[PDB]
Write an enzyme that holds these catalytic residues in place. Sequence first.
Site, short mmCIF file in Angstrom:
data_model
loop_
_atom_site.label_atom_id
_atom_site.label_comp_id
_atom_site.label_asym_id
_atom_site.label_seq_id
_atom_site.Cartn_x
_atom_site.Cartn_y
_atom_site.Cartn_z
N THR A 46 -0.74 2.77 -8.31
CA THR A 46 -1.78 3.57 -8.95
C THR A 46 -1.22 4.75 -9.75
O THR A 46 -1.64 4.99 -10.88
CB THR A 46 -2.81 4.07 -7.92
OG1 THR A 46 -3.57 2.96 -7.43
CG2 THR A 46 -3.75 5.09 -8.55
N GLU A 97 -1.26 -4.93 2.98
CA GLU A 97 -1.41 -3.94 4.04
C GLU A 97 -1.64 -4.60 5.39
O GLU A 97 -2.35 -5.60 5.49
CB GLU A 97 -2.55 -2.97 3.73
CG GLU A 97 -3.94 -3.60 3.73
CD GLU A 97 -5.04 -2.60 3.39
OE1 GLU A 97 -4.73 -1.50 2.87
OE2 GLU A 97 -6.23 -2.91 3.63
N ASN A 142 -1.75 4.92 3.15
CA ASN A 142 -1.79 5.74 1.95
C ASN A 142 -2.89 6.81 1.99
O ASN A 142 -4.06 6.50 2.20
CB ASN A 142 -1.96 4.82 0.74
CG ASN A 142 -1.90 5.56 -0.58
OD1 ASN A 142 -1.75 6.78 -0.63
ND2 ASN A 142 -2.02 4.81 -1.67
N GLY A 201 -2.57 -3.27 -2.60
CA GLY A 201 -1.37 -3.94 -2.14
C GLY A 201 -1.43 -4.47 -0.72
O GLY A 201 -2.35 -4.17 0.04
N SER A 233 0.84 -1.18 0.00
CA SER A 233 0.00 0.00 0.00
C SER A 233 0.88 1.24 0.00
O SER A 233 1.74 1.39 0.87
CB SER A 233 -0.91 0.00 1.23
OG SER A 233 -1.72 1.16 1.26
N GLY A 234 0.67 2.12 -0.98
CA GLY A 234 1.43 3.35 -1.05
C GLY A 234 2.75 3.22 -1.80
O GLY A 234 3.53 4.17 -1.85
N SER A 244 -5.82 5.83 -1.25
CA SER A 244 -5.70 4.38 -1.27
C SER A 244 -6.85 3.74 -2.01
O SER A 244 -8.02 4.06 -1.78
CB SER A 244 -5.61 3.85 0.16
OG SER A 244 -5.48 2.44 0.16
N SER A 245 -6.51 2.82 -2.91
CA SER A 245 -7.49 2.11 -3.70
C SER A 245 -8.10 0.99 -2.88
O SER A 245 -7.39 0.11 -2.40
CB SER A 245 -6.83 1.53 -4.96
OG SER A 245 -6.24 2.56 -5.74
#
Lengths: 696, 148
Positions: A103, A375, A148, A373, A98-99, A151-152
Amino acid sequence: RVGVQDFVLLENFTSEAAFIENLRRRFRENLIYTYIGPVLVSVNPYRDLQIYSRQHMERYRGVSFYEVPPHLFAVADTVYRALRTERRDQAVMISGESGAGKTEATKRLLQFYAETCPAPERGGAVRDRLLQSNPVLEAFGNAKTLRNDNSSRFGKYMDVQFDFKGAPVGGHILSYLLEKSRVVHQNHGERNFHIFYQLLEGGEEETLRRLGLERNPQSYLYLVKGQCAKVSSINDKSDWKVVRKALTVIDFTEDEVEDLLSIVASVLHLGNIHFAANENAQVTTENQLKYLTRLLSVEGSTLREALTHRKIELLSPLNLEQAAYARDALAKAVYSRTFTWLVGKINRSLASKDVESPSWRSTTVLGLLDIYGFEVFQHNSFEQFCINYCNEKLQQLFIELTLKSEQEEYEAEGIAWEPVQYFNNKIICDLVEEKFKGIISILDEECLRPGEATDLTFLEKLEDTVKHHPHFLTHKLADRKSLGRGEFRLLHYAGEVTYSVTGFLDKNNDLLFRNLKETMCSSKNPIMSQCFDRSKRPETVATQFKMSLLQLVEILQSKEPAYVRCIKPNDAKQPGRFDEVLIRHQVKYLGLLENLRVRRAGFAYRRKYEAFLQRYKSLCPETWPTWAGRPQDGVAVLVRHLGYKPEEYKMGRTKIFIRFPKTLFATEDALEVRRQSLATKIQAAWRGFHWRQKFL
Amino acid sequence: ADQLTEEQIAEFKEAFSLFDKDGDGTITTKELGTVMRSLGQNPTEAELQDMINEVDADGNGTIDFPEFLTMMARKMKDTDSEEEIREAFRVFDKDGNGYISAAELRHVMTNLGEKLTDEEVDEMIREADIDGDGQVNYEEFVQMMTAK
Ligand SMILES: [Mg+2]
C-alpha cells in the site's frame, strides 16, 4: 555503495545464503531496494527514511534505470517511459504479505506521477484527486490487525489514464470484496475500520452532538470487540483532519459528507442495541433506536419490528440469538454497500470530463495493483480463505509471466535454453476454483437450501470429494492434532494455514432478510437510497469473487507488466530488525533465486519481426520507406546497420531477442531523433502544397 | 534520374522573373524558397539555407537564374515519394489505423523539427480534416498533398 545493486551481478548467484546476505547488508545501511533484472525487491524499513521527497524524484525522472541506483521511482519512470515511447497499457504488479509495504509502495508511485508528469492544458488536477483518494479509502477500508497497524481489508486495482502528451487526464479504481465481518467483529488486539475512531477523536463538538455520539470509543460495542481502541503508530485526530480535507478534493459536497457520517454513526448506534426478552425478543433501550431513525431516515417502528421479527404469511418473533444476528447482518450490509458506493463516488470524481476527442482513442492506462496480502492468524475463517486464495491466483500470474511463459517461449523459438526448475502453484489454484471438483464449487453445492447442510456437513463432503490431496488436509488424514476437528488445513504457496469451517455457509451466502432489505429501501438518506432499491438470481460470495479475480487476471495479462516484490523484515513491525528465518522463507516461496537464474541467462526484450521492423525501419535506408522481403531478413540488415554485436541479440524462429536493455534504449533514442526528420518531411510537403493552393 | 527538359527550363525561367523584383534577373535569398514551392518542389528549410550559404558567400543576398536552375535540378533528383510521406505519418500513428487526432497532429507539427506556426497548423488541419470531427485520415491527406 553497499553490496551489489542487482542480484544478477551477484557472484555465487546460486547460493541462497549469499542472496539473503546482500539483502541484510543493504538493509542495515538502509538500502531497501534491490534489482533482480527488471524486477525490484523491496524490504520494509518499518521506519521513515525519506527517499520519497521531490529531490529524489528529480534524480530518477527521464533517466535510464541501469544508470542510477535502485529505487521505487526508477520502476515508476521506467514504466512511464514504456508508456510513452510505445503506446501500450502498462501495469505495476506488487506482491507481498500483510504489512510487506504494498500500500505504501503504491502511494509513493502515484506521488511520483503526480508531481513529475506534465500538467494537462484544459485538463484538471486529477493529480490531487488521485492522491487524496487514498486517505478516504484507508479510513473506510483499512483497520489494524496483528499483522499490520494499517491494513487494507479490500483489494485495489487502479488505472491512471494519460493523454498523448503524457499527462494524467483521470483514473479509475476497482475494489475487491471488502472484509464484511470486521464491522460487527474483531479478534482481540484488532480495531474496526479507521473511520470510526477518526470521527470520535477528531469530530467537532457540533457534529458529534448531531450524530448522538460520545467521544469515548469504549462506549460502542462495535468499536471495541478487540479491547483495542488505540494504536501508538496512528494519530486518529490528524487522519480525520486529512480525510475531511480529502473529501472536498474528491468533490464530496458538505451535504454528502454529513450524509455519509449519518451512515457511519448509524452502524455505531446499531451495535449498541440490546435485546432482552418476552417469552420473544425486543429492544430495551430507546436511546440508539432514536438517533437511528433520524440518521437512517426510516420509520422507527418499521425498523424495530424488522429487528425483532421475521416475515414468513405472517410475522413470527425472534430470540436474542436471532435478533442479534439480524442486527449484525444489517450493520454489515449497510457499511459494505456504503463502501461500494464510496468507490463509485470517487470513480465519478476521477473520471475525465470530455465528450469525444481529440482524441481519447490515444489515451493509455497505467495500472497499479494493490491487494490484501497473505495472512495467517491463530483463528482463520472465510475472510482469510478469500484473501489467501486471492494471493494464490495472483501468485500464479507472477509465475506464469516471470518463469513459465518466458521459458516456454525459448523452446517454441530457436533459442538455446537450459530450463530452470520452479514450483507451480497451479495445483493449489485448482484445488479451490476447479469446476465441480473444487472447494468453492462444493461450498456452493452445500449452499442450496437452508436447515439442511451445516458447517460440519460441508467439511464432510469436502473430505469425501477431495481425497488425499497434497495441499489439503483434515483431521481424518495422518497424525493431527495438531490438526483439530471442524477445520481443514490448506497449504498455500506462502505456507500452511488452518481454517475453521464454522460460519462458512452463512458467510458464503450473503443474506439480508427481505424484512431488513425493505426497511432500507424506505430510507430517505440519499446514500442509502442509492445502495438499496426495489426488491431470483442470488450468486454466492465465493463464486462472485472467483468471477472478479478472473476478470482481474485477464485485465493484467493484456498489459505490459512491471514487477515489485515486497518483503517483510519481521513479525514485530520493528525497524532495523532483519529476521533471517522469515526473509528466507519468503525468498523461497516467491522463488527469487529461480528468478535470478532466469534473468542472468535470459533476454530482457523480445519482439516479433514484423512488429520490430514496422517500428524501427526508418533507421535504415534499405528498410525505408519499405521492405519487400521476409521480415526476418529486414530485421537482419536493419540491426546490422544499427550496429548490434552478435552477442547483443539472437534471431529466433518468429522473433528477435535482445539480451540487454541498454541495446534497445540506444535504439529507441535513435528513433526519437529520427522522428525529427520525418516531421520535417511532412512540414516541407505541407509548406509546398499550401503555397501552391492559396496562390496560382 | 530525372533530368531537366528544354520545356522545363522555360517554365522555370518565366516563373523566376515574377520575383525578379528590381529586374536584375536576380532574386533575393530570403525569397528563394517561395519560388521553388511555386514550381512544384517541397524543399525543407535546412535544404534552403544550404543553397543560400553556397551562392550568398559574396553577400548581396542574391541568386541568379543559372544558379537557381542548378538548385532546382538538384532538388528534383531526390524528392520524397508519396510512399515516404505516408510512412512518415504512419510513425506518428500509434493505432496503425491510419488516423491521427488533429490535437496530436498539431502537437507534433509545432513541437518537432522545423516547427510550423500555430497559424500554419490551423490551415493544415482545415483541409486535412475534411469532416471536422477532430480525426484526420493521413493516407487520404497525403494523396491530396502530393497530388499532381
Ligand atoms: Mg491512430
